[PDB]
Amino acid sequence: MERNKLARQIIDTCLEMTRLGLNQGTAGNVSVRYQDGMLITPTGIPYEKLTESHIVFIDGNGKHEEGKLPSSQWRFHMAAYQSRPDANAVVHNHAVHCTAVSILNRSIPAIHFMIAAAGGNSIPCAPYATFGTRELSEHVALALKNRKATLLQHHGLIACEVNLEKALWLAHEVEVLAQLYLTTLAITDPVPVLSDEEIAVVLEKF
Amino acid sequence: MERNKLARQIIDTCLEMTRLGLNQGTAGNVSVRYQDGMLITPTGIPYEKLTESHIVFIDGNGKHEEGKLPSSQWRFHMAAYQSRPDANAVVHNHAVHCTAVSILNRSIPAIHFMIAAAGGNSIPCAPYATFGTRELSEHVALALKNRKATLLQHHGLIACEVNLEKALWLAHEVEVLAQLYLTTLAITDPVPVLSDEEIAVVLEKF
Amino acid sequence: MERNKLARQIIDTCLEMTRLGLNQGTAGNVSVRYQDGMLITPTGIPYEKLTESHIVFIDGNGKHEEGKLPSSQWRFHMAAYQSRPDANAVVHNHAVHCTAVSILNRSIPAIHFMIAAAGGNSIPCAPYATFGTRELSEHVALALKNRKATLLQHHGLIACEVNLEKALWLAHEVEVLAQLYLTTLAITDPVPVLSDEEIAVVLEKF
Amino acid sequence: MERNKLARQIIDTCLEMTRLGLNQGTAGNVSVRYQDGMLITPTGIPYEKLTESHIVFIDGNGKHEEGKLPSSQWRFHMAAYQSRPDANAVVHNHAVHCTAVSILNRSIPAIHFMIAAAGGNSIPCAPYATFGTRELSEHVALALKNRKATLLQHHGLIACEVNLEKALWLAHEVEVLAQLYLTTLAITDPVPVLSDEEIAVVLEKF
Structure with a gap:
């Protein structure tokens, strides 16, 4: 848990994410x-x-390391950390099914019991705001209060978790749910869902 | 057919399954x-x-090897073995097309003659029950009485066969049928099917 | 052009076909x-x-080499060779988009100018008949009279060409056309096509 | 920036393009x-x-190197260079989602803020003309006046940029936008878009 062990795992998560499509x-x-x-x-x-x-290292004040350029989206990574004290890793991507559900400006409802890995009976969609602004950070902060992953309207996905392995796994699970959602929505609307009672059982079991 | 030969083939089927998507x-x-x-x-x-x-080794009484944690779904693997005496290998996954057909709570009808590899003119969908419960095992048992593969509502797929090679192949064939089904259902409902007579001919030929 | 050079290229086409999905x-x-x-x-x-x-070697009389089992579909390979004297290689597969168009029992119309690689303004769909029968061979023979590739209702695809490289390439092109067809058909029916005049120009150019 | 460095990067872009599908x-x-x-x-x-x-080297007069055969589409590569003086690399392909949007003869509207990488609030579709003709070159020239990438009706995609790395990246981004467009269009028409004001903000930010 030295800086370079963590820098290598970030890099491995980037490569792995590309591998998963x-x-x-x-x-x-x-x-x-x-x-x-x-x-x-x-x-x-x-x-x-x-x-x-x-x-890049970005401190608590938003001051980044000299001679480096952090991702243009660093502020909503910071907003996730301040909003979910249990989060230790954040993954952001523009996975195609998640992003297509974000364009429709829909939440993903409980079409599969794995929806509970993100903490409840849905995956929310936070409203659009220009990338890199405080306003986007605020929408992300509010959506992650009771969920570990959120869609970002007209944009993509944010997933957070206790470590990078689980944040990546969650991100992947949300992309499968998004595809399941869109494939079934083309056939029938609305899509059949599991009830709130059943998701309560699954949450207690997890 | 020593324990480690069988343990390696399980592992190869896991890797292969990931390879096939x-x-x-x-x-x-x-x-x-x-x-x-x-x-x-x-x-x-x-x-x-x-x-x-x-x-992990799980005996006939459901007692697993000390110091190990079997899959959370071991009971419906046991239910498949007791229900189909000819089955020697079982594959379970959440392949996306199978799982999307399971969400619609549809059986896959005879849209292709390869439907007969699972033993009749359809691929059933067993009703939902919480994972790991006796009730799920009972639905799996009943669906596999006359079929070698079944969808699991809001969940995924179970395929059984005489060896791991064929169980994996069957699982893959059902995922192709599911995708064929969903791609055509988006265009037209219902989807044209082969008649019961034609499937009787194909079964006699297999 | 010894037997083993040709046997290796068959094998390379099989591996390549799997690579292409x-x-x-x-x-x-x-x-x-x-x-x-x-x-x-x-x-x-x-x-x-x-x-x-x-x-396996199968002679002109349908007698196969002793101690070997030819593909169960050898007869429609023979029917293609007798029907198209210019064909020197035949590829058959169950590619998912081709097979989904075969289930709808549609021909693929001239939605793209590459439709002309198969010899005209469409890709036909030959009617269903049980695999391995003379009746299937007859439908294949008639569909390939003026086309180099045909869909097979509720079944898959046959592509023929002057060598294996081009037969595989054609098979791949028909699978792209099938996917283009199905993706657009979901949105709008009918799908806009190029006219017969335009395809005449493209054929003269090829 | 010798000829062979540039010839190798063309080749790497070809391999990379195949890798990306x-x-x-x-x-x-x-x-x-x-x-x-x-x-x-x-x-x-x-x-x-x-x-x-x-x-192959093609000079400004359209005279190609002796003993070589340039791509059949060289003229619309030349038309892009004369029309966009800032372009130093051009990528053409028949990526399936782009080509399916080209068959519907639609422009891709601002369904995602990355639409601005091509220079405005859309990706145009240039009208069909037979491949290799002056008429096709003219439509390409006019569509690329204010855009860096254009769809080609019943055909495919052209993307241009300051170097091959960015031309390939753009081509890939347009293929993601096309897929996002088609996946959402199947569900709802029209698809929700970002307004002209919002795209003005994003363009100023880029």
Whole structure:
């Protein structure tokens, strides 16, 4: 849990995300909670040229390391950390099914019992705001109060978890749910869902 | 046909399943019939770290090996073995097309002559019950009486066969049928099917 | 152009077909024109264990090599060779988009100018008949009179060409056209097409 | 920035394009601005056999290197260079989602803020004309006046940029937008879009 172990795992999560087909068009950014702020991927540099030394440190005040350029979306990574004290890693991407559900400005309802991995009976969609603004950070903060992952209207997905392995796994699970949702919505609307009682049982079991 | 040969093939089926894109979100579990019970994949451990020694033995009484954690779904693997004496291997996954047909709570009708590989003119959908309960096991048992594969409502797929190679192949064939079904259902409902007479001919030929 | 050079290229076309995602559920069979009959893939043996010595020779009379089992579909490979004297290689598969168009029992109309690679302004769909029968061979023979590739109702695809490289390329092009067709048909029916005049120009240019 | 460095990068862009699944059916062609004309991929030769020496030089007058066959589409590569003086690389492909939107003869509207990477609030669709004609070149020229990428009706996609890395990235981004567009259009028409004001903000930010 030295800085370079964490910088390598960020990089492995970036490569893994591309492997899973969740980072189409190289839009992802990943961070982890570190000291008083976070370590995050940089802007510019393509994932495959990334080395430990490229990872940027952003302190609690939003001051980034000199000579480096943090991802343009660092502020909503910071907003997730302040909003969910249990989160230690955040994954952002523009996975196609999640992003298509974000364009329709729909929440994903309980069409599958794995919806409970994100903490309740849905995956919310936070309203649009221009990237990099305080207003976007505020919508992200509010959507993650009771959920570990949220869609971002006309944009993509944010998933947070206790470590990078689980944040990536969650992100992948939400992308499967989004695809399941869109494939069934084309056939029938509304899509059959599990009731609130059944999701209460599944949450108690998890 | 020693325990470790069977433990390695379980592991190869897990890797192969991921290769085929049937184990999206690492939800699969695989077992084989062994002695008086079965060998099954464990809970926890990600497929790529799996070694022969991780495979769990569950006897006929549901007593698992000490110091190991069997998959959370072991009971419906046991229910398949007791219900289909000819089955020697069971594959479970949450393949996206199968799972989307399971959400619509539809059986897959005879839209292609390969439907007969599962033993009749359809692929049933067993009703939902919370994972890991006796009630789920009962629905699985009844659906596999005359079929070798069944959808699981709001959940995924179970396929059984005489060995792991054929169980995996069947699972893959059902996922192609599910995708064929959903792609055509978007265009036209109902989807044209082969008659019962034609499926009788194909079954006699197989 | 010795038998083993041709047996290796059959095997390479099988591997390549799987690479392209056209041989989902390992249903393909490939042949080439040889001497008075053809060399074809066998039944049984999974593509990855295939060796030169597994390829079967079937003469002009339908007598296959002793000790080998030719693909169960050899007769419509023979029907293609007798029907199209210019064909020297035949590829059959159950590619998902082609097979979904075959289930709807539609021809693919001229939605893209590459439709002309198969010889006219469409890709026909031959009517269903049980696999391996003379009746299926007759429908294949008639559909390939003026086309180099045909859909097979409730079944899959047959593509023929002057060599294996081009037969595989054609098969792939028809699978792209099928997907283009189905993706657009979901939105609007009918799908806009190029006129017969325009396809005449493109054919003269090819 | 010697000829062979540029010939290798063309070849790497061809391989990369296939890796991304944008060159389905090996229809792509790539060029870069060189001296008074351009270096372009040849016709014939499959991408995997391509070597530096296969890349063709076409001067400003349309005279190609002796003993070589330039891509059949060289003229609309030349039309892009003359129409967009800032372009130094052009990518053409028949990516399936782009091509399906080109068949519907639709522009892609501002369903995602990344639409602004191509220079405005849409991705146009240039009208059909037979491949290789002056008339096609004219439609391409006019569509790229204020956009860096355009769909080509019943055909595919053209993307241009300051270097090959960015031209490929743009091409990929347009293919994600096309898929997002088609996946949402199946559910609801019209698809919700970002307003002209919001795209003005995003353009100023880029």
